[PDB]
Amino acid sequence: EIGRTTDPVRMYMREMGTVELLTREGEIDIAKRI
DNA sequence: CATCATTGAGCAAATGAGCAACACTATTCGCATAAGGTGGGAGTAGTGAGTCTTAAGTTGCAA
């Protein structure tokens, strides 16, 4: 039922939609790790 | 016997096309910008005929 979605944009949205938006303090958390 | 035309032969003078080597500058290339800006959009709508290929539905049929 993955409808042969030959647009690469569509599936690219399907992968980038996995990760949700991080707040700005989580950037302090991650750049802390950096 | 003399001499010259007449056939080779090569050269200086001149010149046209370069060459390398430095030296200088035009152009190009590559990097930066701090409050904040966290899911596209046009996508045609009035073909039809055929032929190959799956895909699924049905259906004898035998252990």
mmCIF file of C-alpha atoms (C1' of nucleotides) in Angstrom:
data_model
loop_
_atom_site.group_PDB
_atom_site.id
_atom_site.type_symbol
_atom_site.label_atom_id
_atom_site.label_comp_id
_atom_site.label_asym_id
_atom_site.label_seq_id
_atom_site.Cartn_x
_atom_site.Cartn_y
_atom_site.Cartn_z
ATOM 1 C CA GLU A 1 0.000 0.000 0.000
ATOM 2 C CA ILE A 2 3.186 1.978 -0.302
ATOM 3 C CA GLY A 3 1.792 3.281 -3.501
ATOM 4 C CA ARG A 4 4.944 3.250 -5.670
ATOM 5 C CA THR A 5 5.421 6.837 -4.819
ATOM 6 C CA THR A 6 7.924 7.654 -7.501
ATOM 7 C CA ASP A 7 8.335 11.182 -6.195
ATOM 8 C CA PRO A 8 11.498 11.039 -4.119
ATOM 9 C CA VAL A 9 10.213 14.046 -2.229
ATOM 10 C CA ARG A 10 7.279 12.052 -0.848
ATOM 11 C CA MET A 11 9.412 9.275 0.601
ATOM 12 C CA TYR A 12 11.958 11.871 1.706
ATOM 13 C CA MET A 13 9.191 13.423 3.752
ATOM 14 C CA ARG A 14 8.444 9.937 5.011
ATOM 15 C CA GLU A 15 11.935 9.633 6.422
ATOM 16 C CA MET A 16 12.355 13.176 7.704
ATOM 17 C CA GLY A 17 8.979 12.987 9.399
ATOM 18 C CA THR A 18 10.366 10.432 11.835
ATOM 19 C CA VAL A 19 12.428 12.835 13.933
ATOM 20 C CA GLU A 20 10.425 15.521 15.693
ATOM 21 C CA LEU A 21 11.365 19.131 16.363
ATOM 22 C CA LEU A 22 13.754 19.763 19.219
ATOM 23 C CA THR A 23 13.426 22.798 21.504
ATOM 24 C CA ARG A 24 16.321 25.219 21.889
ATOM 25 C CA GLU A 25 17.436 23.890 25.264
ATOM 26 C CA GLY A 26 17.901 20.473 23.704
ATOM 27 C CA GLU A 27 20.369 22.227 21.437
ATOM 28 C CA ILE A 28 22.229 23.194 24.603
ATOM 29 C CA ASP A 29 22.080 19.520 25.510
ATOM 30 C CA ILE A 30 23.427 18.324 22.178
ATOM 31 C CA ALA A 31 26.000 21.060 21.578
ATOM 32 C CA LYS A 32 27.106 20.283 25.107
ATOM 33 C CA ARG A 33 27.813 16.769 23.824
ATOM 34 C CA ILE A 34 29.668 18.297 20.881
ATOM 35 C "C1'" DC B 1 92.946 30.275 -80.052
ATOM 36 C "C1'" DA B 2 89.678 33.161 -77.590
ATOM 37 C "C1'" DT B 3 85.165 34.079 -75.441
ATOM 38 C "C1'" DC B 4 80.708 33.942 -73.929
ATOM 39 C "C1'" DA B 5 76.472 32.068 -73.023
ATOM 40 C "C1'" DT B 6 74.952 28.975 -70.223
ATOM 41 C "C1'" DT B 7 74.324 25.939 -66.947
ATOM 42 C "C1'" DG B 8 75.300 25.016 -61.510
ATOM 43 C "C1'" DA B 9 76.090 26.860 -56.906
ATOM 44 C "C1'" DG B 10 75.820 29.063 -53.097
ATOM 45 C "C1'" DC B 11 75.530 33.545 -50.350
ATOM 46 C "C1'" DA B 12 74.050 38.252 -47.801
ATOM 47 C "C1'" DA B 13 70.408 41.000 -46.953
ATOM 48 C "C1'" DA B 14 66.397 41.091 -45.392
ATOM 49 C "C1'" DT B 15 62.153 39.578 -42.958
ATOM 50 C "C1'" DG B 16 58.341 36.970 -40.955
ATOM 51 C "C1'" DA B 17 57.185 34.012 -37.421
ATOM 52 C "C1'" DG B 18 58.743 32.773 -32.762
ATOM 53 C "C1'" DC B 19 60.512 31.998 -27.836
ATOM 54 C "C1'" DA B 20 61.411 32.181 -23.185
ATOM 55 C "C1'" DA B 21 61.474 34.639 -19.358
ATOM 56 C "C1'" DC B 22 60.051 37.923 -16.187
ATOM 57 C "C1'" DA B 23 56.644 41.125 -14.564
ATOM 58 C "C1'" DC B 24 52.660 42.969 -13.829
ATOM 59 C "C1'" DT B 25 47.248 43.076 -13.239
ATOM 60 C "C1'" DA B 26 42.341 41.399 -14.231
ATOM 61 C "C1'" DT B 27 39.556 38.131 -12.973
ATOM 62 C "C1'" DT B 28 37.879 34.537 -10.373
ATOM 63 C "C1'" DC B 29 37.133 31.804 -6.386
ATOM 64 C "C1'" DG B 30 36.161 30.948 -1.897
ATOM 65 C "C1'" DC B 31 34.765 32.211 2.533
ATOM 66 C "C1'" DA B 32 30.610 35.188 6.050
ATOM 67 C "C1'" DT B 33 26.520 37.415 7.611
ATOM 68 C "C1'" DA B 34 23.795 36.092 14.929
ATOM 69 C "C1'" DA B 35 16.381 38.066 17.916
ATOM 70 C "C1'" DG B 36 13.242 34.885 14.674
ATOM 71 C "C1'" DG B 37 11.766 32.294 9.971
ATOM 72 C "C1'" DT B 38 11.248 24.125 11.652
ATOM 73 C "C1'" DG B 39 6.097 19.389 5.938
ATOM 74 C "C1'" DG B 40 4.742 21.423 -2.294
ATOM 75 C "C1'" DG B 41 2.458 21.935 -5.609
ATOM 76 C "C1'" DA B 42 0.825 21.620 -9.743
ATOM 77 C "C1'" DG B 43 -0.887 17.435 -10.629
ATOM 78 C "C1'" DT B 44 -5.738 16.288 -16.390
ATOM 79 C "C1'" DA B 45 -9.956 14.869 -16.341
ATOM 80 C "C1'" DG B 46 -12.959 14.402 -24.570
ATOM 81 C "C1'" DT B 47 -9.332 7.878 -27.049
ATOM 82 C "C1'" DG B 48 -9.505 3.263 -28.613
ATOM 83 C "C1'" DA B 49 -7.746 -1.252 -29.857
ATOM 84 C "C1'" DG B 50 -4.995 -4.658 -28.755
ATOM 85 C "C1'" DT B 51 -1.792 -7.575 -26.470
ATOM 86 C "C1'" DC B 52 0.905 -9.401 -22.704
ATOM 87 C "C1'" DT B 53 1.054 -10.172 -17.801
ATOM 88 C "C1'" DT B 54 -0.329 -10.943 -13.262
ATOM 89 C "C1'" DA B 55 -3.688 -11.825 -9.718
ATOM 90 C "C1'" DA B 56 -7.334 -13.568 -8.002
ATOM 91 C "C1'" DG B 57 -11.413 -16.212 -8.073
ATOM 92 C "C1'" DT B 58 -13.449 -20.553 -8.875
ATOM 93 C "C1'" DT B 59 -13.557 -25.383 -9.415
ATOM 94 C "C1'" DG B 60 -12.889 -30.359 -10.524
ATOM 95 C "C1'" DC B 61 -10.553 -34.061 -8.232
ATOM 96 C "C1'" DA B 62 -7.828 -37.291 -5.709
ATOM 97 C "C1'" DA B 63 -5.756 -39.081 -1.310
#
